[PDB]
Design a protein around this ligand. Structure first.
Ligand code: 6ZZ
Length: 261
């Protein structure tokens, strides 16, 4: 066979992913994923996205006839990069650059009508040369990066990923997740303890959870939780971690933010 499986990547409720030797292409490493039996549509969206070969999205090499997906392989995810970084942590300009690359791939995906929906450091790939690549999106548990509207079961638009990006931004400074909740209700609580209770006008209509189920008074200063963050990074982090997804910054606006002057 064209590929020899060597290891399992992780273990996800999306199916098994293998690290494999690409016997025909110089024995390079590839990430192999099998699909079972709108799905045809998703694969076409993925192949179409690959035509652009955006630098900040994982390369798709092949699609084999039930259906097997061949991607490039990258050694580390953001998790293992933040776990191995020497003290006191990640250089200020390394965080800036990585965040710019994250928003570049995100704006590319959003402008092509793709919502990641499950952005976390575990699916952000960090290349040998320091390139950030978005992976594991566009195909049909940790709530630590889950947006408030997903938690509330109301909307699932592109702002969902900007909340996730804000959580990752903070975690790049802290090297620990900003909101380590254990359930959707807990997660939403841990969030409102930091950002404060939103205006009744910012609370989604016809959701199970009312605003009155929480009493997380005022917004605590974010510098308490994210120590070492500059004033400009604080503006971008607040704009990402905005309650109302309509009021949330977009990936396109974030790319222009003074933080990246
Ligand atoms: C397969 N699909 C659809 C993809 O988009 C895809 C293309 C990929 C290319 N290289 C990796 N590398 C990689 C990523 C995470 C981890 N870790 C796992 C957690 N513990 C630490 C080590 C280890 N190696 N993963 C890829 N993925 C996915 C991203 C999430 C897993 C599979």
């Amino acid at each position: 066979q064209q590929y020899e499986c060597v290891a399992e990547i992780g273990e996800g409720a999306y199916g098994k992913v293998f690290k494999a030797r690409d016997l025909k292409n110089g024995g390079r490493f590839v990430a192999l994923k099998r699909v079972r039996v709108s799905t045809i549509r998703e694969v076409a969206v993925l192949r179409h996205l690959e035509t652009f070969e955006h630098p900040n999205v994982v390369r798709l090499f092949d699609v084999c006839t039930k259906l097997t997906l061949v991607f490039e392989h990258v050694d580390q995810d953001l998790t293992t990069y933040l776990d191995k970084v020497p003290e006191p942590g990640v250089p200020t300009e390394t965080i800036k650059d990585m965040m710019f690359q994250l928003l570049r791939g995100l704006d590319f995906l959003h402008s092509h009508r793709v919502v990641h929906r499950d952005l976390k450091p575990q699916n952000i790939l960090v290349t040998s040369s320091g390139q950030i690549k978005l992976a594991d999106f566009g195909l049909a548990v940790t709530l630590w990066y889950r947006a408030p509207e997903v938690l509330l079961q109301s909307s699932y638009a592109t702002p969902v990923d900007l909340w996730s990006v804000g959580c990752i931004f903070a975690e790049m400074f802290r090297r620990k997740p900003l909101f380590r909740g254990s359930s959707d209700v807990d997660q939403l609580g841990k969030i409102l303890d930091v950002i404060g209770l939103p205006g009744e006008e910012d609370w989604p209509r016809d959701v199970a959870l009312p605003r009155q189920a929480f009493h997380s008074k005022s917004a605590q200063p974010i510098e308490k939780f994210v120590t070492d963050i500059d004033e400009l990074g604080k503006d971008l982090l607040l704009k990402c971690l905005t309650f109302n997804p309509a009021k949330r910054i977009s990936a396109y606006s974030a790319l222009s933010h003074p933080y990246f002057q």
